[PDB]
Amino acid sequence: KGEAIRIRSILRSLIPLGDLVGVISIAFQMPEPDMSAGF
């Protein structure tokens, strides 16, 4: 299909891949419990 490819291209142009990899790589802490109202 063509319109599906166009929508995928629009999403790719809107959201960069490196930004997504960086957001995935944050390595949140693993905690006496803590509060889960954060990341």
């Binding site: 063509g2 166009r6 291209s9 629009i10 142009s13 809107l14």
Partner: protein, 352 residues
């Protein structure tokens, strides 16, 4: 009331109100050397004229979305709203398309607009929409209607982006109004007759000479000088002239007697200017005054009619031919006429 047919030369202008000042900026394309387009100042044409030669596009085909997608998955028509058009640059011959790379860092999601050779894909097509509620889809487009051009591939608007020095039109999601000023209606252009915006030259009846400037062997200040010359210069690049009219619409119509137009040298890019302390020379665009660089063609030597013709909004009438049309140059300020001199003294008559 005039409809927009196919195979006609049009101009894409827009209005920008920046720094509490309005301006009319056009879409232009260099074509050779670079791909992306840029903007031209149609307004402020009093001291700096716009290069209308590269701001002219032609509509090739007008298909609907269904016909376009069918042709991609595989005549003098009338432009209708909602259709898809193909804008071929008149000068370069390429086609206007939406590029994929980015140049303006201010728009991290917009695309550039430029030219491409092939017509394949959805990049080179642009769908047309109205900019008012009074005209709906399927209606016939007329002159002066405010239109919106949307990319078929990226589904982005042809937006007028603002920048300090990156005054570049891009493909953004914010729409922008565009006016379509016709130049040549694609109708019966009279063969052998003078048409506006043409590149031509002048000859004599029994002299076989043409109006030209010195060649590149001399400096630019010497090339600024103007003269007549014969021989191999009859077929030369430095012997051609362009009739750049003052109007922005229908400038490629039948040129009639008496109307003003600048004489541009295609090789130097300058105009035939005149300051009274000297004779006529060549001067650049950045100081080209309308009154200083405006000339006209008379059919006689008298001064019977000067301010007779004001404005004709149409193709005009086939009046001036190429072969059997004896014109006479006449300045809009001084009203003088061409004279050939004998600047070469008898000591060097048999030379140049």
């Amino acid at each position: 009331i005039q409809f927009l047919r196919t195979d006609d030369e049009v101009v894409l202008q827009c209005t920008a109100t920046i720094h509490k000042e309005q301006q009319k900026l056009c879409l232009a394309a260099e074509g050779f050397g670079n791909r992306l387009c840029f903007l031209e100042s149609t307004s402020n044409s009093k001291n700096v004229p716009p290069d209308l030669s590269i701001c002219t596009f032609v509509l090739e085909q007008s298909l609907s979305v269904r016909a376009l997608q069918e042709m991609l998955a595989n005549g003098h028509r009338t432009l209708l709203y909602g259709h898809a058009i193909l804008l071929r640059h008149s000068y370069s011959g390429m086609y206007l398309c939406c590029l994929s790379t980015s140049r303006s860092s201010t728009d991290k999601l917009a695309f550039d607009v430029g030219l491409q050779e092939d017509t394949t894909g959805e990049a080179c097509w642009w769908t047309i929409h109205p900019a008012s509620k009074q005209r709906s889809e399927g209606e016939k487009v007329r002159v002066g209607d405010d239109l919106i051009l949307v990319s078929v591939s990226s589904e982005r608007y042809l937006h007028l982006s603002y920048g300090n020095s990156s005054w570049h039109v891009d493909a953004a999601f914010q729409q922008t109004l565009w006016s379509v000023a016709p130049i040549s209606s694609g109708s019966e252009a009279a063969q052998g007759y003078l048409i506006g915006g043409d590149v031509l030259r002048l000859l004599h009846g029994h002299m076989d000479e043409c109006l030209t400037v010195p060649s590149g062997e001399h400096g630019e200040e010497q090339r600024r000088t103007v003269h007549y010359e014969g021989g191999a210069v009859s077929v030369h690049a430095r012997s051609l002239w362009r009739l750049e009219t003052l109007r922005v619409a229908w400038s490629g119509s039948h040129i009639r007697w008496g109307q003003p137009f600048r004489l541009r040298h295609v090789t130097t890019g300058k105009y035939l200017s005149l300051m009274e302390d000297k004779n006529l020379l060549l001067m650049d665009k950045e100081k080209a005054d309308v009154k200083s660089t405006a000339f006209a063609f008379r059919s006689s030597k008298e001064k019977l009619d000067v301010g007779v013709r004001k404005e004709v909004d149409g193709m005009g009438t086939s009046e001036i031919k190429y072969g059997d049309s004896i014109c006479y140059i006449q300045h809009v300020d001084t009203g003088l006429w061409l004279t050939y001199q004998a600047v070469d003294v008898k000591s060097a008559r048999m030379g140049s």
